Design a protein around this nucleic acid. Structure first.
Ligand SMILES: Nc1ncnc2c1ncn2[C@@H]1O[C@H](COP(=O)(O)OP(=O)(O)NP(=O)(O)O)[C@@H](O)[C@H]1O
Ligand SMILES: Nc1ncnc2c1ncn2[C@@H]1O[C@H](COP(=O)(O)OP(=O)(O)NP(=O)(O)O)[C@@H](O)[C@H]1O
Ligand SMILES: [Mg+2]
Ligand SMILES: [Mg+2]
Lengths: 331, 331
DNA sequence: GCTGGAGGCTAAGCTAAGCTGA
DNA sequence: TCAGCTTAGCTTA
């Protein structure tokens, strides 16, 4: 058997194996792409638990017609030009294996119109080589993605899809986590056409209690302890629940963000777990939302396909900083 | 800010961010390539903790000149042709992004000679466009990879290399895990030219115990309890230590394999952790080397870039099966 | 003697609570 | 004001 180059559709389907875990991961990737384009209104429209239709609409800068084809392509992005840019990144996007993977394992139609361009355009990728065709359409300034029949072309991945309810629950979990990360963009979720969740954006210099309550819950809000802890460029803000009377209903909310990204990292969770176990004695594991800010040069984020976990250049210092911050919180 | 295709060197450097974590990951990837290729003698030579030179030599099938050129390329492999092959994986390779990534973040000089072809060939990929140069060389039947000056051209990642000692410790850990996974191949590790570890291959139907002692110490062997728990298609074989007198020195040995690949999976580790914490006190978490064998269709392995986390189609059944197996072991 | 790095399910069905229609 | 339907929480696989 010879060493032969995989056809681009097959290569993208393999990339979809790591970056597209469930319909929830498709919603996360498309929402992040909209947020990086400076969008303020995000309208997500899940149908049949994401298996049938996932539609995301935004009021972002859009994708001009000629570059629409290269947007759907693989290893093609407008967020890095060289390794130096990758060292100091601010966007939620580095590589071009985001739209390529989803378009490979589904029927992805990309409708967009930039503010400068008068007329909107559609683009969808099909075939063994994933060629893209651009048809004219009507849309306001912004972009709309429709992911239809997810894993239609990969029978094995469809076998992995769970029931309609659980898949929407995972999509709702990702929407809630994105909404907390950015308290400045309105996110409107809708399942089977019936509105499920609406978060109205609090403007810069506003009250953060209302939206956080709508996402976390009233119990978390009345039991929230807002914090601010700085040892230099390391700054840890956010709300931590009180462990004295935390209920199992509140236990599900354990989110941590590093420079505005969703972190499911071992180091940070372990630091909080040690802090909780030291000033309590047992694993009550109280609810918390922590926003950590560091120079992007002290952190490496190109570590995981879905960019959940992160590698810190100052691992022991960051662990000590988070541990001291949570220890101060429990006072 | 236009959408531009990333140059191949940059794209491969980004892939290296996820697949090439440390010199240990480079040793793991190159050793896996040799085993699947069919090798009985693997000779690894780490110099200056992997930072200066990593050389892996095998007695495998080798790579002919034209296929040698495509070996260094990205998305080029001889282990999958279509999705059906990806469903029915019996090899340790799916994508072509491992050698492309290592050749991107280092000076990779692949040298090989197949059994049939007359003479050996040395091939290396260089430049921002990653052109491949194939010069003549001398080598017996098999292949040799030399990774020199790891992360020389990526200063951002070199700062993450810890020391000479720790990097070799991680390489030694991966070598011991590979050796246990296949008791069929001789693996000879050498640091700065001084032999550190030698494991001689036990012939088919041979006694495993002596090699297991060389990898996990005599204490594991006097405290070993072999198992064969089989329910339906699921078979959990291997050796588990006794928690009655387990030392912290033995606690480092917690390896688990799914269809003969090294798993750092959340579901499996969690199941063993629950089983140990139910029939023990003070979180004893005893040492174990357990081989799970499952139908290749009921587990998905294309889940993580470094392939140490699997997605099971029957998550609850597999968790219960492993939990029951370890619970039976602890009596 | 000092120094790195942190193990840690997941999903479906049933029952209870709240809101809307008769 | 009471009954029925939908959504959330809990339990077992
Ligand atoms: N909603 C949007 N509005 C405007 N531009 C967009 C939008 N979505 C995607 N784009 C652009 O289109 C390109 C498509 O590439 P993509 O694969 O999404 O890159 P990425 O976001 O950097 N990838 P990743 O690292 O996986 O997150 C991006 O570089 C964006 O700049
Ligand atoms: N030691 C070796 N001996 C023989 N053939 C080899 C060897 N190493 C690599 N090859 C061949 O070169 C190709 C390149 O493999 P590589 O780029 O590492 O990806 P892969 O191993 O096929 N998949 P992945 O698990 O992602 O790394 C393989 O398909 C093999 O056919
Ligand atoms: Mg993207
Ligand atoms: Mg490989």
């Amino acid at each position: 058997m010879p060493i032969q180059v995989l056809p681009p559709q097959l290569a993208n389907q393999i990339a979809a194996g790591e970056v597209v875990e469930r319909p929830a991961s498709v919603v996360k990737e498309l929402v992040e792409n909209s947020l990086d384009a400076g969008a303020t209104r995000i309208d997500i429209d899940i149908e049949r638990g994401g298996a049938k239709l996932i539609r995301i609409r935004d009021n972002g800068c859009g994708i001009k017609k000629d570059e629409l084809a290269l947007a759907l392509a693989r290893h093609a992005t407008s967020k890095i030009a060289s390794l130096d840019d990758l060292e100091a990144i601010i966007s939620l996007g580095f590589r071009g294996e985001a739209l390529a993977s989803i378009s490979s394992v589904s029927r992805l139609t990309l409708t967009s119109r930039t503010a400068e361009q008068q007329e909107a355009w559609q683009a969808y990728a099909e075939g063994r080589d994933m060629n893209v065709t651009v048809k004219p359409a009507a849309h306001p300034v912004g972009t709309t993605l429709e992911v239809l029949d997810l894993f239609y072309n990969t029978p094995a991945r469809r076998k992995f899809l769970r029931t309609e309810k659980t898949e929407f629950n995972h999509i709702d979990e990702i929407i809630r986590r994105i909404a907390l990360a950015r308290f400045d963009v309105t996110i409107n979720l809708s399942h089977n056409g019936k509105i499920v969740r609406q978060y109205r954006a609090v403007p810069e210099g506003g009250q953060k209690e209302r939206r956080l309550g709508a996402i976390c819950g009233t119990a978390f809000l009345e039991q929230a302890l807002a914090i601010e802890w700085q040892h230099g460029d390391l700054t840890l803000r956010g709300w931590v629940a009180d462990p004295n009377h935390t209920t199992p209903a509140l236990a599900e909310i354990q989110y941590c963000y590093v420079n505005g990204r969703m972190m499911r990292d071992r180091l940070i969770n372990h630091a909080i777990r040690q802090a909780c176990e030291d000033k309590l004695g047992a694993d009550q594991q109280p609810a918390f939302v922590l926003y950590l800010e560091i120079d992007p040069h002290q952190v490496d984020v190109n570590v995981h396909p879905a960019k959940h976990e992160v590698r810190f250049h100052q691992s022991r210092l960051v662990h000590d900083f988070i541990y001291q911050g949570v220890l101060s919180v429990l006072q």
